């Protein structure tokens, strides 16, 4: 998963 997608999902 790209960084922004991963951060969006987590937060």
């Amino acid at each position: 998963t790209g960084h922004r997608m991963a951060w969006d999902m987590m937060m």
Partner: antibody
Amino acid sequence: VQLLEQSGAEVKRPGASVKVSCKASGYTFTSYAIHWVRQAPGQRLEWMGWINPGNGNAKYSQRFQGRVIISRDTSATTSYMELSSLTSEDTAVYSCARDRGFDLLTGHYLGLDPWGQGTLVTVSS
Amino acid sequence: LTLTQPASASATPGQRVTISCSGSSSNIGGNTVNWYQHLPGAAPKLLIHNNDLRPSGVPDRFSGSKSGTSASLAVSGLQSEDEADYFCAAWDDGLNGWVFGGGTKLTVLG
């Protein structure tokens, strides 16, 4: 000023478990992810995992999955990293860092900042 | 995984020095590079985020660039206080987590 303050140095025997703490202040604790990383003597930093302190959702590196638990206490604005089944390979400085995340207006990534001072864990028989 | 940096870099005061970080399509290729200064006994200090942006407080003599799967930190008008370890960091799409360079010890010659 934002601070992440970590628990003190620990000495553990092989097969034991260690729990390191990271006390946050100076910002809204539940609004930013916390990451845990470690660095063994002579080696590079290695990422272990992260947690959304708002809901407790934690995710881990496949290298540690199954023996690390990252958690938080929101009333104490503290995150914890527990690592089980210790061996001498686990001797390292364990550090937390705050994810400033992405700027919602610009899309820029803002960085992992600040970082805790680290907690040395020594595993020895 | 791994980002690759030279073990050391050095220059005289006033000179410009560059430190490189090499990675792969799944980290530096697709995500931003972020650089930290590490001084003895102190937590890492963010110097550059999002490839080339300086946080508040960071002197304008520090700059960053990224191109393809590589990136560079440049320090111009080198001062003795700049002697430190510098390391790069980027999200890795395969790890779904952060990867870090091994660090470069910058010596200010003299």
